[PDB]
Amino acid sequence: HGAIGAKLMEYALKVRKVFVTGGVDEKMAKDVVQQLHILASISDDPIYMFVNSPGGHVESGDMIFDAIRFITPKVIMIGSGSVASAGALIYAAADKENRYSLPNTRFLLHQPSGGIQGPASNIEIYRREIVRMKERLDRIFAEATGQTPEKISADTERDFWLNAEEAVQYGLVNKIIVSEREITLP
Template sequence: MNYRLEDEDEDTRVDETPDTPPAGKAEQLFFKSRNVIITGAIDDKLARRAVTQLLALAEDSDDPINVFISSPGGHVESGDMVHDIIKFIRPKVRTIGSGWVASAGALIFVGAERENRYCLPNTRFLLHQPSGGIGGQVSDLMIQAEQIRIMAERFHKLFAEATGQTPEKIAEDTRRDFWLTTKEALDYGLLGKVISSVDELA
């Protein structure tokens, strides 16, 4: 469709076509690929974006969804949100680690069943105790400390179920930063398979 700018002659017409702009085409192709990318710090904005994509893809079809993760971690409850939605929706979700999968990023990673957890060859994993900033009056300190204790117990149970380890072992291993190579993650039950190509996805 042609639009004429006022007070301009025929040579200054602006041609506009109804074609989808390149950015829009890229988004459509990305949606059709059924891939979700989670990178950087985990916060409420990232969680909202990831969950929106997961729910939209689940509504679109029951075909598998790939969630690529490279994250240093972040807000635990935001990680919980994505973790729970991965389990909630009907399509099979495959989590694929790349770079590093740490803390709340690892929480999202184990939202998939073990056989659907993959990583690329140079991925590192980090598990550690959940933490939080504590401040305020003594009564508030006690409440916050109790909430961290409850969160830690839930963390131990969740990762025990995801890996086949006991909650006690998870608690012991994560007293300090617990780094794992891909081989160690496989042996620990955190990871299902190391892959180098998309063709290796089951």
């Protein structure tokens, strides 16, 4: 399937569309980041990103988030199906006015804390990274939604899901759409 995927990749790049489908792992993040940088070098025109993901590696979500924020082109974010954990972090990288959702999309902002591994010598090092990461994520979603970090931290549990209309009221989604014609470019 590599040959088919490579061919679809090439065509998707030519039409400035990026797909984040399924679990976010290092292989996807590596491909998505390069795609974004390639597209940004080709033109400043918008890039369309389609997200339908149940979660994945947070460092992989972080890489995509950082690349979206880094490049000059605006990323038009279309969420569908489930947008959970690493997928929701990715979704939040786009500017508010460019965040769309289909009517049936469900959003989960909680990020799994992950597992520790390594020497016990450096447990203090592990502690501060846990605190730092939670505080970073709270600020990201607070800034993305207009909520306070405390509200984000309080609201964000393992089972706090938002449907598309709830995500609009919460500040995560700008507009619910069913057709690409309903997108308004900046």
